[PDB]
Ligand binder design. Structure first.
Ligand SMILES: CC(C)(COP(=O)(O)OP(=O)(O)OC[C@H]1O[C@@H](n2cnc3c(N)ncnc32)[C@H](O)[C@@H]1OP(=O)(O)O)[C@@H](O)C(=O)NCCC(=O)NCCS
Length: 173
């Protein structure tokens, strides 16, 4: 089973290594220096953009990184049409290339979705994989997200996917 813990400052050097692995570099929104990671992913810095970092754990070992964010609190250009403060967005990665395509990502996303719905004010979860990122799209579908359509983001077009609280209630059983 995959669990999630808050990321700390002590995880930054580890995250730096992960973010420079080829399987991560090709998708993650490119090759950050250690200083880049320390300056941008420090939990208190991410907090300023309403972003919460997590480390995914499996059998006592860190296996991935995830982020949740309040869409309404995102930076300029991001989710500019949003009006609901209950909307959360997610992003995630698996650290080890050998562990890709084995269902661990789906387990990670499911764990993150459950955590977020334990915030009573949360109404809906969104994700924004790029159209080219078909593996991520299928992962989110397996985790209970539904493709809505194409949206323009500051990083380019994305396949906008959502999972509502009601949908989670009906499938969690
Ligand atoms: C996205 C990510 C977290 C998904 O985790 P994962 O464990 O690899 O995904 P899962 O094994 O749970 O599911 C992958 C699904 O995608 C499918 N798939 C893989 N490549 C595909 C492709 N090119 N086209 C269509 N489907 C594809 C697999 O068949 C599998 O579905 P299945 O169970 O029906 O066979 C992981 O691949 C990852 O960290 N990728 C690199 C970073 C990244 O892309 N981050 C997300 C950015 S939005």
């Amino acid at each position: 089973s995959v669990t999630l813990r808050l990321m700390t400052e002590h995880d930054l050097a580890m995250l730096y290594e992960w973010l420079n692995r080829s399987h991560i570099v090709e998708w993650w929104g490119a090759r950050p220096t250690l200083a880049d990671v320390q300056e941008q992913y420090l939990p208190s810095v991410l907090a300023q953009e309403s972003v919460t970092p997590y480390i995914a754990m499996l059998n006592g070992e860190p296996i991935g990184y995830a982020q949740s964010y309040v869409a309404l609190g995102s930076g300029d250009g991001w989710w500019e049409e949003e009006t609901d403060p209950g909307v959360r967005g997610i992003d995630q990665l698996l650290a080890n290339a050998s562990q890709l395509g084995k269902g661990l990502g789906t387990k990670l996303v499911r764990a993150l979705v459950e955590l977020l719905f334990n915030d009573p004010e949360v109404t809906k979860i969104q994700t924004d994989p790029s159209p080219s990122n078909l593996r991520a799209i299928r992962c989110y579908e397996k985790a209970g997200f539904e493709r809505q359509g194409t949206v323009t983001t500051p990083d380019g077009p994305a396949v906008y996917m959502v999972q509502t609280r009601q949908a989670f209630e009906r499938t969690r059983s």
